Design a protein around this ligand. Structure first.
Ligand SMILES: [Zn+2]
Ligand SMILES: [Zn+2]
Ligand SMILES: [Zn+2]
Ligand SMILES: [Zn+2]
Lengths: 123, 123, 123, 123
């Protein structure tokens, strides 16, 4: 049902766009939306660190700038193509758009977002 | 040189994608990048308000997820198609990607970002 | 070892300071730091929603503006004094300052942050 | 009316608390509130860069966790005690709490926030 090799690959591609001059730590993400399209995002840092955009947040922006809908699955990777768990902020924003059933690429098996952010605030 | 009617129109289109169930205040943005392509973004709210994504930040994500480069001009509008000045956070993130010379759609004449965020922190 | 009734009460007090004109949803937090002092925080909203400050983030700011150290326990509550789980963003920021062993007030028993943000990004 | 030497000094003190292991770029802030008390804040970074808290945002949290009110004047400094202009995000959050008349320490003369964030979004 979810081609994880494809999603992960798109996340790996997407990582290539990261604007990460401060950390040099590129992140890409790719998500499958409920209509079968995939949207991607990369890391975008800012001199004011707290204004940096996460790749998974970029994905959510793409989601809504391309017709919205629900996220079914997301892979997040570093610039080396390694699977990354989304930061807590991203877990919260993904939840809004995929709910607890959103699959997040690996550990050794994609995880439900619900398990990555249990007892989530607040709707 | 900059088709502002086009950019503003794209920002107006882009506003249609806003996920704004909390504020009901849709924002769209569209920017011209140095290679002539235009990238767009809309507002994406979250139950945790501080995780909401600005449309202009969505634009910057699109920028880098589509090859990066420099932003030359940006229009930001509300869901009514009215010109909006970017919030301070967006002014900072746009600066990273357009610098002080980035034109921002209107007042009655597009403004340099440099004038919208004078004496900007911090590079 | 942790007076949860005290922490929760301080979180309830702290909620009273929330600047929440947009959501009307007050949040307070109080944390015990490794030296036995307690630091508190409340929700601070902004017209640009994504600039709203979480109460638990306020706590972390207090932590470092009062000598830093490690967070041992945190209660987060709404304006009604109900226990709230921190949003994903707060779970990530708390982790930086309390690690996985940081106790977070309730469900029916305080939880390790590690369990609230399993397999956390990224250090 | 505003003891800027005092505010700047408090901002310099406050900078000492910064949690800045990623950038090593400490920021402190101190603000005078309408009741004459001063509240302070420092920079707090996170591994997820975009979750870093600005010192001026820390100030606003202190403001409301200490009774709220309006900010009259703010100095922001780096770890070297040099005057810093607030990032765009901070200019927006300060505006909510000080309005356009909030004085911001230097260039060679404190500036109105209104001039640092002209034509501000959006209330
Ligand atoms: Zn993230
Ligand atoms: Zn904005
Ligand atoms: Zn939070
Ligand atoms: Zn700032």
């Amino acid at each position: 049902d979810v081609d994880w090799n494809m999603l992960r690959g798109n996340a790996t591609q997407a990582a290539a766009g990261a604007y990460v001059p401060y950390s040099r730590f590129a992140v890409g993400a790719a998500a499958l939306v409920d209509d079968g399209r995939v949207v991607t995002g990369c890391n975008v840092e800012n001199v004011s660190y707290g204004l940096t955009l996460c790749a998974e947040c970029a994905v959510v922006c793409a989601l809504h700038s391309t017709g919205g809908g629900r996220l079914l699955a997301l892979a997040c990777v570093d610039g080396h193509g390694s699977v990354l768990m989304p930061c807590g902020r991203c877990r919260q924003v993904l939840l809004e758009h995929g709910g607890s059933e959103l699959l997040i690429d690996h550990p050794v098996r994609p995880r439900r977002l619900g398990d990555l952010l249990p007892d989530a605030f607040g709707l």
